[PDB]
């Protein structure tokens, strides 16, 4: 069946995040499709918080019937390991997937 949720609803749960530890790295993976790479702002703040922020222009000329895709994104991720303040964190974005690998010390 077809129950359509509000865009405001999706806003509070977008995006879905996988976080896990392997090989001395905290690997954070988020389904974050349809964004400009230069408009995705991710950073670890104060040793224990990963903040992912993104903005996009949604241009859809014509008549809207359904609108669920959010324009703004903000997700604070409780981080388990209070990672090091100093190390090099990787950040890739391909196929809509934002993958962030954080080194643990």
């Amino acid at each position: 069946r077809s129950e359509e949720l509000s865009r405001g609803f999706y806003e509070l749960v977008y995006p879905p995040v996988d976080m896990y530890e392997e090989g001395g790295y905290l690997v954070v993976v988020a389904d974050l499709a349809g964004f400009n790479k230069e408009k995705i702002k991710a950073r670890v703040s104060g040793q224990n918080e990963l903040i992912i922020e993104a903005e996009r222009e949604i241009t859809e000329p014509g008549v809207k019937y359904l609108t669920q895709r959010p324009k703004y994104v903000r997700k604070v991720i409780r981080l388990p390991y209070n990672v090091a303040k100093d190390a090099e964190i990787s950040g890739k974005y391909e196929n809509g997937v934002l993958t962030i690998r954080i080194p643990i010390a």
Binding site: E38, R43, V44, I89, S90, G91, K92, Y93
Partner: peptide, 5 residues
């Protein structure tokens, strides 16, 4: 801060 490549 983090570079998204």
């Amino acid at each position: 801060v983090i570079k998204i490549e």
